[PDB]
Design a binder for this molecule. Structure first.
Ligand SMILES: COCCN1CCC(CNC(=O)c2n[nH]c3ccc(-c4cccc(F)c4F)cc23)CC1
Length: 350
C-alpha cells in the first residue's frame, strides 16, 4: 500500500511542523464538510482518523481553533493538522488528524437493541458520566458542542473509555451575539431551538445528553420526530405541553404552532419496570423545558446515579479496572469547586 508523507503541525504546543507518514487510507464517512478517512501511521503503527474539509485560504477554521485549545481524556485528541491542495486554483483542504477509536455508543446500543437486550446499567453509568465530564470541560471555556448524539460518542470496548468527537457544529457562545436555531441532530434537539431561539446557552448539550441517557435505558430514541416541527410533538407526548412561563424561558422567535393541551406522562411509566429510580430521577433533571432548570454537566456527574462508579470495589464486566474518572483539573471544576468533595471520593483524593 502506497505511503503518503506530509509536513503536519502538532495540535497542542507551539507551531513546530514535522514530517508525518501514513498508509492504508480508506473512506469511512462523508458530509457537507467534505470527507473522513481512516489511516495507519508508518512509524508507530497507530490508527488515526483524518477529517478532510474544503477551507477558504483567507478565512480561519472555527473547528481547528477549538480543537487546538482542548486537552481532555474524554475528548478525541487533535494529533496533527495539515493543508493539501486541490485540482482547481485557490482550492485548499484542511486535514485534521485525530486518534482512531474502534466503536461508538450508536453501534454498541444498536447491538443490544437488535438482539432484544438492554445495555447493562454499569455501561450506561460509565458512558454518561464520561460524557458529562467532556461537557463540563468544554462548557468551562464557553464552548457548546451543538451536536451531542450517540454517533459522536466514540468508545473503546475493552477499556470503556468514551471520547467526544466531531466539533464541526461547535461554537464559543457569547451573550448577546445571535446563533442559528436549526442546529443539533433532530432527535437530540432542545425544545428552545425548535421554538426558534437564537439566544440559547450550553444547556442545549445537557438536553441532548438527557436524550442519550433515555435512549440507552429504553433501547430506542425517546423523541423520534419525523420533521423539525413533529419533534416538538414527540417531546410533548412525554413532558406534556409547556406552560407560557416555560415557553417564555425558552426565549422563542415564534410560538405559533397551535398545539393542543396534553398532560405529562409520568417518568416511571416511560421506562421499563426494573429501570433504576436514580436513572429516572437524573433523566427528569436533564429533560426540563426551562433551560436554566437543567443540571449543569458537573452537577450531573455528582448525581446519585453515578455513586457505583465512586465505590472503590467497582470493576468492568471484562475483569479490568475502570478508566480514570476522578483526575479533575481546576479548569473542569471551575463552575462549582465545592462539588469536588462529592466528585473525588476518599480513595481518589490527592
Ligand atoms: C460499516 O463500517 C463502519 C466502519 N466504522 C466503524 C466504527 C468506527 C468508529 N470510529 C470513528 O468513527 C472515529 N474514530 N475517531 C474519529 C474522529 C472523528 C470522527 C468524525 C465523526 C463525525 C464527523 C467527522 F467529521 C469526524 F471526523 C470519527 C471518528 C468508524 C468506522
Amino acid at each position: 500500500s502506497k505511503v503518503t508523507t506530509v509536513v503536519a503541525t502538532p495540535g497542542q504546543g507551539p507551531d513546530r511542523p514535522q514530517e508525518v507518514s501514513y498508509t492504508d487510507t480508506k473512506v469511512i464517512g462523508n458530509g457537507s464538510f467534505g470527507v473522513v478517512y481512516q489511516a495507519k501511521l508508518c512509524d508507530s503503527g497507530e490508527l488515526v482518523a483524518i477529517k478532510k474539509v474544503l477551507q477558504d485560504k483567507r478565512f480561519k477554521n472555527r473547528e481547528l481553533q477549538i480543537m487546538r485549545k482542548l486537552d481532555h481524556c474524554n475528548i478525541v485528541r487533535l494529533r496533527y493538522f495539515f493543508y493539501s491542495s486541490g485540482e482547481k486554483k485557490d482550492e485548499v483542504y484542511l486535514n485534521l488528524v485525530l486518534d482512531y477509536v474502534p466503536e461508538t455508543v450508536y453501534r454498541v446500543a444498536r447491538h443490544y437493541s437488535r438482539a432484544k437486550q438492554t445495555l447493562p446499567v454499569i455501561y450506561v453509568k460509565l458512558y454518561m458520566y464520561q460524557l458529562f465530564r467532556s461537557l463540563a470541560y468544554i462548557h468551562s471555556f464557553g464552548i457548546c458542542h451543538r451536536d451531542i448524539k450517540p454517533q459522536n460518542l466514540l468508545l473503546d470496548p475493552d477499556t470503556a473509555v468514551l471520547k467526544l468527537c466531531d466539533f464541526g457544529s461547535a461554537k464559543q457562545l457569547v451573550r448577546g451575539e445571535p446563533n442559528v436555531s436549526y442546529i443539533c441532530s433532530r432527535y437530540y434537539r432542545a425544545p428552545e431551538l425548535i421554538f426558534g431561539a437564537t439566544d440559547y446557552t450550553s444547556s442545549i448539550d445537557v438536553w441532548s445528553a438527557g436524550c442519550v441517557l433515555a435512549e440507552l435505558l429504553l433501547g430506542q430514541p425517546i423523541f423520534p420526530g419525523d420533521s423539525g416541527v413533529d419533534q416538538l410533538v414527540e417531546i410533548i407526548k412525554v413532558l406534556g405541553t409547556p406552560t407560557r412561563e416555560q415557553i417564555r424561558e425558552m426565549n422563542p422567535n415564534y410560538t405559533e404552532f397551535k398545539f393542543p393541551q396534553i398532560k405529562a406522562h409520568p417518568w416511571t411509566k416511560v421506562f421499563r419496570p426494573r429501570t433504576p429510580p436514580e436513572a429516572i430521577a437524573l433523566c427528569s433533571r436533564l429533560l426540563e423545558y426551562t433551560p436554566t432548570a437543567r443540571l449543569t454537566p458537573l452537577e450531573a456527574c455528582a448525581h446519585s446515579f453515578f455513586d457505583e462508579l465512586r465505590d472503590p470495589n467497582v470493576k468492568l464486566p471484562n475483569g479490568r479496572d475502570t478508566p480514570a474518572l476522578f483526575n479533575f483539573t481546576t479548569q473542569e471544576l471551575s463552575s462549582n469547586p465545592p462539588l469536588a468533595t462529592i466528585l473525588i471520593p476518599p480513595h481518589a483524593r490527592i
